[PDB]
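worker-03 picked up job from queue 'complexes'. Input manifest follows; three sequence lines, order preserved.
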Amino acid sequence: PPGPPGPTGPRGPPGPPG
Amino acid sequence: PPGPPGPTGPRGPPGPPG
Amino acid sequence: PPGPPGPTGPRGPPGPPG
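worker-03 finished. Artifact:
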């Protein structure tokens, strides 16, 4: 069978400062 | 065969205070 | 046997403004 989905990608960067 | 690529990661955290 | 996990996914999008 095909392998599992790869690891989920890393979390995105923080938003811009307020 | 290889599994599919992992999904796109979660959105980043809110930005820092200004 | 089963294939290997896929590649790690793309980085997530940036967070919302602080």
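worker-03 released lock.
Chain B touches chain C through 18 residues (CB under 8 Å).
Residues 3 and 9 of chain B are 17 Å apart (CA to CA).
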